[PDB]
Each structure stands twice: as C-alpha cells, then as structure tokens.
Design a protein around this ligand. Structure first.
Ligand code: NA
Ligand code: NA
Ligand code: NA
Ligand code: NA
Lengths: 478, 477
C-alpha cells in the first residue's frame, strides 16, 4: 500500500486533477494488452521478410513499413498485419478497466482498437467518439467522455494513419486533431500509458506535444524500469548499457513536460491506478436507504433531512450516488438538483449520479442477480456509503430492508467506508449497532470513527447537528 | 396561418429543433422590446464631439474610429455604445421564447448578458464563451453554449468596439471564427435582431462564408419596408426605400441566408410561438402522485408508469417528470432504462428533471413556488398525461389538488390534457369533468373525447393502455 516517493507524488497530483476534472489519458498500444507492452520487432517480422529485410538488422521500423507501401504501391498488406490482426489481439488490461471506470472526461489514443469506447459503453458512460476530422465539428450533448482516435479506427481501415508518408503530412490532413490536442495539453493533466521507446511511431506522437513554455503543463508517462541482470544474449556490460541508456529516454520526455513514472513490472500499473481510484472516490458518496415508514421520525421531517443532506454534500464539493431506494431516493435527487441549479456556475449535473435500477427479469438473469449487479456497480462508483432508515413492507408488516444490508456488505467487502446513521432507525440502526459490537473489526482503518458512529447511533441524538457531524466525518475521511 | 414562405420556415425550424441542429444568432434588436435599434441616435453625440453629424455621416463605424483616433482612447466611445447601450437591454418576447426552447447553440454580437441570464432563470446550464480562452474547454453536461463574439459587458476592455478591432478580428479572435464556420456547416441558424442600418453588419456577414459544397440555408427576420412615406418622404422616396430592400434581401442569399419578412416586429414572437407550439407536441408532461393505488396493485401501477415512460423515450418523445410522490421515481427509472438500453439512439435529453419546491422563501410562500414550478415545467411540454393523484391530508387519503392545478395550467396554455381515469383519484375526476362538458374540453381534437372516455372507465382493460396512449400521442403530432 506504499510506493516510491515519485509514484506517491504522482498519485497525489493525479487524484487532485481527477477531482478538479482536468485529468486526461493518452493511451498507447500497451494499454490494449494484459502484457502491458508490445513487441514491435515481431509484429513487423513478416513485412520485413517480404522485402528481403529482417527486423534483427532493420532498426527503423517506420521506414520498413513505408518500403512495403512503396513496393506494393498500397496500404492493404501493411494494414492487415499492423491494424487488422494487431487490433483483434486487443484485450482490456486491468489498468484499462480502471481508467474507463473513473470519471475521466478526455481520452486520447493512437490505438485503432475499440477497447476504450467499448469499456465506456459497458460502464454506462455516453462517449463522444472522434474517429475523423469531421466528427470534431459537433459535440455530442450530455456526453460523459470524449475519445479522440488520432490515427483512425478499425471501423474504416482506409482512413487510418499507418505509414510514414501519412505521419509526415498529419499536421495538415488532421489539423483538427492537432489543434484539439494542443488545447488539451495546456488545460489538462495527461497520463501517457502504454507507450514504449521501441514504439516506431513515438517520435511522431511526441513532436505533436510542443506548446509555448509559458503554457506548458506537467504530464506523466508510465515506463517499465530496465531490469538489472542480463536478457537473452547479453552480458553485464550489455545489461548496464541497456539500463543507463534508459536514463536518456527519461530526460528526453521532459522536453514535452512529461515526467516518467517508473514501475518495476507492468503489473504494478493497475495497483498504482487502484490507489488513485480509492483516494479519489473518497469524495463520492453513496446514499443507501429506503422507507415505507419513518418510525420516530415524521415523514416530512425525514424527507427534509435527506433533501438537506444531499444538497449539502453537493455544496461541499461531493458527488452523490443515488441508491434510488423507495421513499429516500426522491429526496436525494431533489436535494442534489436544488443545489446544482442554485449555482449552475459552480456545481454541476455531474455531482448527481443516477443509473436505472432493475425492474424486470431477463431470460438470462433473475431479478435476484440484476439487483446484486446494480448494487455492485453503483457502490463501485463511491468511496463512502451513508445508510439511512431502511425498511419495507413484507407480508403486511414492516421489516428492516435486506437490500440496505446487502449494500452494506458489498461496501465493506470492497473497502468502501460505511457510515450508518443509527438515529434514523431500522436497518441503519441494526447496522450501526452491529459495527459497534466489534469495533476492532469494523473500525480498523479509522479508529476515531467508532465514537462518531456511536454518537450518531443514539436514538436521542440531536437531529439538527447530524448534517454538520457527517460533513466533518467525510472531510476527515478524505 | 402565415405566408407560404413563413410557413415553410416554421416547418423547417421545427424539424431542425427536433433534430438538435437549430441555432440562433442574436443581434441588438433581440435585446429591445421594440425589436430594433436607432443607430444614428446612439452615435449622435459621438459625431457632435468630432464636429460631424449623424445626419450627414452614413458610415458610423468610421465615425466611432475617428472618435478613438482623436481621443487616443475608446473610453468615451465605450460609455455610449457599450455601457449605456447595454444598460437599456430588455428581454423581448422573442428573446424569452428562444431562451425557453431547447436550442443548444446561441451566437451573439451583443454585449449584454440577457441570453446568459435567461438560460439560468430557465434552469439551463450555460457554457458562456466570453473570450477565446474559454473555447479551449467544454463545460460538461451543458444545456447550451453561448458565444459572445464581440465580448461582454463583464470585461469592457476586451470588447470589440471600433473599426480597427473589427479589421483584425480574423486574427485576434480566430477561435470564434473557426467555431462559427463549423456551426455554419452543421446547424440551421436563425438570425434575429439585425437590420441593414447596423453599422457593423458587413463585418458580421463577411464571416459567414463557407465552401458552396458545405453551405446550408439559414434564416433572418427582417421587417418589410412600409408603403406609406415617413420623415420627409413622398411616394417617390418611399418607393425608393422599398425597392432598395429587395437588394438587401437578394444580397443575403450569397451567404445562404433567406429573409423571413414580417410586417411588424410584433409578428416575430407570433411566428416563434407557433414554432414552439408545434415543436412541443413531442414533449410529454407526466402529472401524478400516489400515497395509495386503490384498485391497482402498487407494483402493478409502478410497472405501468415505468413501461409508459420507457415507451415514450423509445418512440422519440421527451419526458418531463412532474416528480410526484409515488409516480416520479417510476417515470425516472423507466426513461433511464430506455436511454441506457440503446445509448446510441436514445439520449439523456429525453428526460427532463428539475427540482421541486421544498422550503418557503422570504419573497415567496411555498404556495407560490409550487405554482411557478408547475407553470415552468408544463411550459416545457405540449401534451400532459395525468395518472392517479392522491396524497395524505389530516390523516386520510384525498385526491391531489396539485394534479388538478397542473391540469388547469395545461388547459389555460394550450397544452393537450390526457387524464387516464382508469387510474382513479384525481385523474378520474378530471376525465369525468372533461366528459361532462365535451363542448369546452374537446374543441381542438373532437376525436379525443372517445379516447378519453374508453380510458376513463374504472373497469377499462389495463393490458393495452400504454399502446393506446402512444397511438393517441402520434395522432396529436
Ligand atoms: Na432534521
Ligand atoms: Na421515492
Ligand atoms: Na430491500
Ligand atoms: Na397536491
């Protein structure tokens, strides 16, 4: 759970930039491999062999590809290997799924595959996909993210950027992409992921990143640190040359404002991203609860409290994930929306997260499983969960709501801080009391929280001070 | 009924609104209730200070530049044509309509903030571009973008005011020009508030050139020149005034702009309200609330509401959620299910949700805030459906008076009202009330009386209600 001082500073910075909304991703081929990297020599082996060349002797693979286009006067043979087959091997990394889950608004990529767009759709995120310059003219309304496919798309291989001659003229043929990228480079913090210094195309991509020093920003790029001891037909002299050479790569990236984030293995990347996610989600609050009745609370008193709580979370900079429970979810919605439109300059519709809950069975899944998948997904978008009331009618009598407990379990199992408010009674009280029954188990990560949950579980707790105590708890948890 | 040309404009803009490609380009006239500006009078004293006269100076752009040249400063000029000028800005009826409608793109050369202010009052989140720097980043989840091409009363020092700045605009404000050229080939503009006495009209129009292959047809409101003389005119001078306008009209075409001619400026809001009335026939307000469901099982009723709302989205309608207790949550879930069912064909814009009143205010009782909420939300719709409608009151179940108030607001404003009496309670009361005086409630659509009658029977068969409602809405369209 602890990283380098350099990685640690990157985590702190990118979390903050995710919160402000200026975080961006630039994705290379490595991101579309569970491996995390690509062997370019092997990909071009056959193209070179068809020219009487060999990737062992040819170190300029961009020129080899161009020679292939020249000799056959056509892009198709090249396109089959480096675009068509290359993209069918694409697989979503763990790092890929994390980045698609986070509320990152801007994805740039030179990949041809559809993994980014596909993952966004799976996570119920409406994507504005820019596959060609024409797509840049109009903005998809209410999009959750924009995805720039700089070099085209497997969907239209004829329009993809594949070989040297196209790279050389990209600044004119695709001026719109370059202009958009230059704007994002001076307004956003990029995470470059999936790039290697054996990428034949790297220099072309990096040369597009120049901006006036007055406006230059600092960005980040994952790189695997070269291992110490030999590889293949190498000796300790060859190993040390391989390593010290990498120091010049790292310094070169600074030209473009890019700071290398070194990892010893590609498997380290998803762990760093998970840490970023967990720290970032501490400001996204899941509201769990439902009510057929309100017990020691008057209904309008309860709904008014829920409304005010939701509004305050928005006004204090939190994102609210609505559990959509009966008799609670409507007040969550109305409270958050009231705050949003109170100050449409400051707050945003992004601060209220709503996704439809299951209504009907499917042929493949019972309502049983759709509900559990819904709760897992919604809690997955949050870092803290508040539990309120929680009761429903069953065979004519009021019972504590099992679905509220299930959300509680999912949250605990996944590291989401659980904050039941026992003063609201019912399942919230049942859960608060249960936590206090084993403080060494339930309050390991935050021992100071036992006292707070105990005060808020007291049925005679002062209801006017609940909101401010919750707010102080959430700020300390962050 | 309007002229054939105006009628064709109405039909085209309604469809472009529905498609989401409608745009507005607002001139000074839109910020005056009269609909026009007297430019010679605005510059009268500027000219007098240079020893000139607006009676004899026909080029007011140059007069303003001469004022800057003489004083080596735009301070005096800016006071008259920016400060005082924008202080007299008033939202016209045409302004209010265009701010109401779901137009995504507003361009303007006005300095005032009437568009931005109206959008917020209408609970529309605006992305306001006052400077080229603002163009780099897009406000997420915006309901509209507003381009202030010539700057803003907010930062007078950065506003476009005089000839020299116009001449270099294509360089200093290149971002605005590039964005406009993209919108001109992607959207259908309505130019409103411009006259051919606008000293800077040529500067504005010259920015509208695009390759013919990509040129679209736009529209521009213009007041037809009157026949009768005015101000030192006889019938020769008045006929000269009129025939000159024919060349203005023809000239607009080389920019792809078709003049929409009106006899009076007051005709503009009438054409715009006809546009709104027709456009809104695919926006459905769902009125209803329920503490209990009577002869319906609770999950049966919520399932019906869910399916109805989903079906509305899937058949191309926008759903305005009344947000009633026990009904609004199913409206939301049904619509959201449809939207994310096929997120490439359906959109989040098909569900309209705005907060309802919770707390009294020092200037408005809760009673007033509720009425204003209902008027605003019904104002967004052309058809309103009424379902159930009951609440708890002094310990008992009563029919929901709010549902009837929403019914009355709808009827008073020309919104088609479709109560489903089979859902009982207030919806049944309103269905029976309409059926008791068909002469008054079914004037516009006589065939609707039969449909309401079959849906009003408490014993009516519930399996095909949604299918019947959708057929009714399609005919109303
Ligand atoms: Na309270
Ligand atoms: Na509810
Ligand atoms: Na439950
Ligand atoms: Na009511």
């Amino acid at each position: 759970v602890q990283f380098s001082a350099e990685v640690e500073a990157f985590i702190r910075t990118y979390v903050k930039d995710l919160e402000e909304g200026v975080a961006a991703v630039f994705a290379g081929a490595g991101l579309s491999r569970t491996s995390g990297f690509v062997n370019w020599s092997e990909l071009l082996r056959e193209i070179a062999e068809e020219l009487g060349l060999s990737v062992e002797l040819e170190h300029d693979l961009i020129s080899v590809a161009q020679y292939h286009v020249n000799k056959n006067n056509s892009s198709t043979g090249l396109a089959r290997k480096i675009l068509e087959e290359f993209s069918e091997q694409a697989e979503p990394s763990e790092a890929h799924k994390i980045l698609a889950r986070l509320p990152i608004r801007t994805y740039w990529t030179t990949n041809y595959d559809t993994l980014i767009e596909d993952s966004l759709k799976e996570n119920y995120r409406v994507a504005d996909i820019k596959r060609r310059t024409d797509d840049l003219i109009s903005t998809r309304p209410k999009r959750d993210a924009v995805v720039y496919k700089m070099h085209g798309d497997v969907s239209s291989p004829g329009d993809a950027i594949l070989y040297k001659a196209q790279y050389e003229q990209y600044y004119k043929t695709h001026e719109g992409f370059v202009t958009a990228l230059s704007g994002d480079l001076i307004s956003k913090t990029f995470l470059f992921i999936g790039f290697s210094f054996t990428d034949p195309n790297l220099d072309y991509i990096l040369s597009r990143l120049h901006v006036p020093e007055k406006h230059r920003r600092r960005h980040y790029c994952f790189l695997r640190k070269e291992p110490s001891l030999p590889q293949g037909n190498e000796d300790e002299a060859g190993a040390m040359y391989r390593q010290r050479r990498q120091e010049h790569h790292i310094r070169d990236l600074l030209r473009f404002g890019i700071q290398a984030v070194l990892v010893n293995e590609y498997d380290d990347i998803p762990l760093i991203l998970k840490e970023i996610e967990s720290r970032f989600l501490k400001k996204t609050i899941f509201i769990s609860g439902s009510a057929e009745e309100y017990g020691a609370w008057d209904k309008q008193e309860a709904l008014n409290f829920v409304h005010i709580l939701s509004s305050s979370l928005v006004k204090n900079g939190y994102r609210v994930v609505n559990g959509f429970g009966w008799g609670i979810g409507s007040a969550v919605i109305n409270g958050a929306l009231e705050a949003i439109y109170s100050k449409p300059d400051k707050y945003s519709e992004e601060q209220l997260i709503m996704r439809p809950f299951p209504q009907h069975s499917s042929n493949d899944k019972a309502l049983s499983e759709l509900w559990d998948e819904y709760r897992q997904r919604m809690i997955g978008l949050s870092g803290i969960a508040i539990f309120l009331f929680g009761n429903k009618l069953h065979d004519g009598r009021i019972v504590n709501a099992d679905g509220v407990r299930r959300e509680f379990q999912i949250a605990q199992e996944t590291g989401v801080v659980v904050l039941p408010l026992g003063v609201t009674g019912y399942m919230a009280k049942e859960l608060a009391d249960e936590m206090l029954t084993d403080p060494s188990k339930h309050f390991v990560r935050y021992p100071w929280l036992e006292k707070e949950v105990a005060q808020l579980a007291d049925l005679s707790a002062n209801r006017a001070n609940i909101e401010m105590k919750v707010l102080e708890i959430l700020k300390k948890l962050g």
